[PDB]
Amino acid sequence: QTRTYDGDGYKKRAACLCFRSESEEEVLLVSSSRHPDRWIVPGGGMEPEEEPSVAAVREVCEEAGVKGTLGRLVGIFENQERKHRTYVYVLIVTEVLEDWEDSVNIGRKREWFKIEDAIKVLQYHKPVQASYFET
Numbered sequence: 001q002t003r004t005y006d007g008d009g010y011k012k013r014a015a016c017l018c019f020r021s022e023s024e025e026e027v028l029l030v031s032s033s034r035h036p037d038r039w040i041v042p043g044g045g046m047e048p049e050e051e052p053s054v055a056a057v058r059e060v061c062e063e064a065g066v067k068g069t070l071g072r073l074v075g076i077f078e079n080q081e082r083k084h085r086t087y088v089y090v091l092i093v094t095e096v097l098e099d100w101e102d103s104v105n106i107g108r109k110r111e112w113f114k115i116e117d118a119i120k121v122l123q124y125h126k127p128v129q130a131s132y133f134e135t
Protein backbone atom coordinates (compact mmCIF):
# COMPACT_ATOMS: atom_id res chain seq x y z
CA GLN A 1 0.00 0.00 0.00
CA THR A 2 3.00 2.36 -0.61
CA ARG A 3 1.88 4.98 -3.19
CA THR A 4 4.12 5.69 -6.20
CA TYR A 5 4.59 8.81 -8.32
CA ASP A 6 5.83 9.98 -11.70
CA GLY A 7 8.72 12.47 -11.84
CA ASP A 8 6.15 15.35 -11.95
CA GLY A 9 4.62 14.21 -8.60
CA TYR A 10 1.43 12.73 -10.11
CA LYS A 11 0.28 9.51 -8.38
CA LYS A 12 0.68 6.44 -10.62
CA ARG A 13 -2.53 4.39 -11.14
CA ALA A 14 -3.83 1.60 -13.32
CA ALA A 15 -7.36 0.48 -14.19
CA CYS A 16 -9.21 -1.88 -16.54
CA LEU A 17 -12.26 -1.55 -18.70
CA CYS A 18 -13.74 -4.90 -17.61
CA PHE A 19 -15.91 -6.04 -20.56
CA ARG A 20 -18.42 -8.88 -20.35
CA SER A 21 -17.15 -10.29 -23.72
CA GLU A 22 -14.89 -9.60 -26.75
CA SER A 23 -17.81 -7.53 -28.23
CA GLU A 24 -16.91 -4.77 -25.63
CA GLU A 25 -20.65 -3.78 -25.35
CA GLU A 26 -21.03 -4.00 -21.53
CA VAL A 27 -18.51 -2.91 -18.91
CA LEU A 28 -18.30 -3.51 -15.13
CA LEU A 29 -18.35 -0.45 -12.86
CA VAL A 30 -17.97 -0.47 -9.08
CA SER A 31 -19.43 1.81 -6.38
CA SER A 32 -17.44 4.89 -5.20
CA SER A 33 -15.92 4.35 -1.69
CA ARG A 34 -16.57 8.09 -0.81
CA HIS A 35 -20.15 8.18 -2.26
CA PRO A 36 -21.54 4.63 -2.68
CA ASP A 37 -24.52 5.84 -4.72
CA ARG A 38 -22.03 6.77 -7.49
CA TRP A 39 -20.15 4.54 -10.02
CA ILE A 40 -16.43 4.50 -10.97
CA VAL A 41 -14.06 2.41 -13.14
CA PRO A 42 -12.19 0.01 -10.82
CA GLY A 43 -8.49 0.99 -10.49
CA GLY A 44 -5.83 2.09 -8.01
CA GLY A 45 -2.25 2.82 -7.14
CA MET A 46 0.74 1.08 -8.72
CA GLU A 47 3.09 -0.48 -6.10
CA PRO A 48 6.86 0.14 -6.28
CA GLU A 49 8.45 -1.47 -9.38
CA GLU A 50 5.00 -2.94 -10.30
CA GLU A 51 4.27 -3.20 -14.07
CA PRO A 52 1.16 -1.11 -14.96
CA SER A 53 -0.67 -4.16 -16.51
CA VAL A 54 0.01 -6.12 -13.25
CA ALA A 55 -1.33 -3.25 -11.06
CA ALA A 56 -4.46 -2.93 -13.30
CA VAL A 57 -5.37 -6.67 -13.02
CA ARG A 58 -4.60 -6.65 -9.26
CA GLU A 59 -6.76 -3.59 -8.48
CA VAL A 60 -9.68 -5.03 -10.57
CA CYS A 61 -9.49 -8.27 -8.57
CA GLU A 62 -9.42 -6.32 -5.24
CA GLU A 63 -12.20 -3.82 -6.10
CA ALA A 64 -14.47 -5.65 -8.60
CA GLY A 65 -13.84 -9.36 -7.82
CA VAL A 66 -13.23 -10.33 -11.47
CA LYS A 67 -10.46 -11.97 -13.48
CA GLY A 68 -9.97 -12.39 -17.19
CA THR A 69 -7.89 -12.08 -20.35
CA LEU A 70 -5.78 -8.90 -20.37
CA GLY A 71 -6.05 -6.96 -23.63
CA ARG A 72 -4.59 -3.74 -25.09
CA LEU A 73 -3.45 -0.58 -23.32
CA VAL A 74 -6.18 1.99 -24.24
CA GLY A 75 -4.14 4.98 -23.12
CA ILE A 76 -2.60 6.95 -20.26
CA PHE A 77 -5.00 9.48 -18.70
CA GLU A 78 -4.21 12.41 -16.44
CA ASN A 79 -6.54 13.96 -13.87
CA GLN A 80 -5.11 17.51 -13.59
CA GLU A 81 -7.43 18.41 -10.69
CA ARG A 82 -6.46 15.32 -8.57
CA LYS A 83 -2.80 15.05 -9.84
CA HIS A 84 -2.83 11.36 -10.91
CA ARG A 85 -1.97 9.49 -14.08
CA THR A 86 -3.74 6.21 -14.95
CA TYR A 87 -2.81 3.43 -17.37
CA VAL A 88 -6.12 2.00 -18.67
CA TYR A 89 -6.25 -1.57 -20.09
CA VAL A 90 -8.94 -3.72 -21.72
CA LEU A 91 -9.82 -6.85 -19.63
CA ILE A 92 -12.22 -9.49 -21.05
CA VAL A 93 -13.86 -10.92 -17.92
CA THR A 94 -13.83 -14.76 -17.70
CA GLU A 95 -14.25 -15.23 -13.87
CA VAL A 96 -16.79 -13.48 -11.55
CA LEU A 97 -15.91 -14.24 -7.90
CA GLU A 98 -18.25 -13.95 -4.88
CA ASP A 99 -17.12 -12.39 -1.54
CA TRP A 100 -14.20 -10.40 -3.09
CA GLU A 101 -11.89 -8.15 -0.97
CA ASP A 102 -13.88 -4.87 -1.24
CA SER A 103 -17.32 -6.61 -1.02
CA VAL A 104 -16.30 -8.12 2.37
CA ASN A 105 -14.39 -5.04 3.64
CA ILE A 106 -16.44 -1.96 2.51
CA GLY A 107 -19.64 -3.42 0.87
CA ARG A 108 -18.46 -2.34 -2.59
CA LYS A 109 -21.06 -3.01 -5.32
CA ARG A 110 -20.51 -3.89 -9.01
CA GLU A 111 -22.82 -3.77 -12.01
CA TRP A 112 -22.73 -4.26 -15.82
CA PHE A 113 -23.44 -1.14 -17.92
CA LYS A 114 -23.90 -0.75 -21.65
CA ILE A 115 -21.04 1.57 -22.79
CA GLU A 116 -23.30 4.62 -23.38
CA ASP A 117 -24.86 4.17 -19.85
CA ALA A 118 -21.38 3.82 -18.24
CA ILE A 119 -20.30 7.13 -19.92
CA LYS A 120 -23.56 8.75 -18.57
CA VAL A 121 -23.07 7.69 -14.89
CA LEU A 122 -19.32 8.60 -14.90
CA GLN A 123 -19.74 12.09 -16.43
CA TYR A 124 -20.67 14.15 -13.34
CA HIS A 125 -17.86 13.32 -10.88
CA LYS A 126 -15.52 11.21 -13.09
CA PRO A 127 -15.40 12.92 -16.52
CA VAL A 128 -11.84 11.64 -17.16
CA GLN A 129 -13.12 8.06 -16.60
CA ALA A 130 -16.02 8.77 -19.00
CA SER A 131 -13.28 9.78 -21.52
CA TYR A 132 -11.72 6.27 -21.21
CA PHE A 133 -14.54 5.03 -23.56
CA GLU A 134 -14.19 7.82 -26.25
CA THR A 135 -11.92 5.49 -28.40
Ligand SMILES: O=P(O)(O)O[C@@H]1[C@@H](OP(=O)(O)O)[C@H](OP(=O)(O)OP(=O)(O)O)[C@@H](O)[C@H](O)[C@H]1OP(=O)(O)OP(=O)(O)O
Binds near residue numbers: 013
Ligand atom coordinates in the same frame (compact mmCIF):
# COMPACT_ATOMS: atom_id res chain seq x y z
O1 LIG B 1 -13.09 7.28 -6.46
P1 LIG B 1 -13.64 6.97 -5.17
O2 LIG B 1 -13.96 5.44 -4.92
O3 LIG B 1 -14.80 7.90 -4.60
O4 LIG B 1 -12.49 7.27 -4.07
C1 LIG B 1 -11.14 7.55 -4.41
C2 LIG B 1 -10.21 6.35 -4.18
O5 LIG B 1 -10.72 5.26 -4.89
P2 LIG B 1 -11.11 3.86 -4.18
O6 LIG B 1 -11.32 4.09 -2.75
O7 LIG B 1 -10.06 2.84 -4.59
O8 LIG B 1 -12.38 3.59 -5.00
C3 LIG B 1 -8.82 6.74 -4.59
O9 LIG B 1 -7.95 5.65 -4.42
P3 LIG B 1 -7.24 4.96 -5.70
O10 LIG B 1 -8.27 4.23 -6.58
O11 LIG B 1 -6.44 6.02 -6.45
O12 LIG B 1 -6.18 3.91 -5.11
P4 LIG B 1 -6.32 2.46 -4.37
O13 LIG B 1 -7.44 1.72 -5.23
O14 LIG B 1 -6.71 2.75 -3.00
O15 LIG B 1 -4.96 1.85 -4.68
C4 LIG B 1 -8.30 7.86 -3.67
O16 LIG B 1 -6.93 8.20 -4.01
C5 LIG B 1 -9.19 9.04 -3.84
O17 LIG B 1 -8.77 10.10 -2.95
C6 LIG B 1 -10.66 8.71 -3.54
O18 LIG B 1 -11.41 9.82 -3.93
P5 LIG B 1 -12.22 10.77 -2.78
O19 LIG B 1 -12.35 10.13 -1.41
O20 LIG B 1 -11.57 12.23 -2.88
O21 LIG B 1 -13.86 10.80 -3.34
P6 LIG B 1 -14.54 11.36 -4.75
O22 LIG B 1 -14.74 10.02 -5.56
O23 LIG B 1 -16.02 11.87 -4.27
O24 LIG B 1 -13.67 12.48 -5.41
Ligand SMILES: [Cl-]
Binds near residue numbers: 019021022025026027
Ligand atom coordinates in the same frame (compact mmCIF):
# COMPACT_ATOMS: atom_id res chain seq x y z
CL1 LIG C 1 -19.63 -7.25 -23.87
Ligand SMILES: [Cl-]
Binds near residue numbers: 126128129
Ligand atom coordinates in the same frame (compact mmCIF):
# COMPACT_ATOMS: atom_id res chain seq x y z
CL1 LIG D 1 -10.41 10.24 -12.64
Ligand SMILES: [F-]
Binds near residue numbers: 044045
Ligand atom coordinates in the same frame (compact mmCIF):
# COMPACT_ATOMS: atom_id res chain seq x y z
F1 LIG E 1 -6.35 -0.25 -3.50
Ligand SMILES: [Mg+2]
Binds near residue numbers: 062
Ligand atom coordinates in the same frame (compact mmCIF):
# COMPACT_ATOMS: atom_id res chain seq x y z
MG1 LIG F 1 -7.89 -0.22 -4.75
Ligand SMILES: [Mg+2]
Binds near residue numbers: 043044063
Ligand atom coordinates in the same frame (compact mmCIF):
# COMPACT_ATOMS: atom_id res chain seq x y z
MG1 LIG G 1 -9.08 2.35 -6.30
Ligand SMILES: [Mg+2]
Binds near residue numbers: 044045059
Ligand atom coordinates in the same frame (compact mmCIF):
# COMPACT_ATOMS: atom_id res chain seq x y z
MG1 LIG H 1 -4.49 -0.08 -4.06
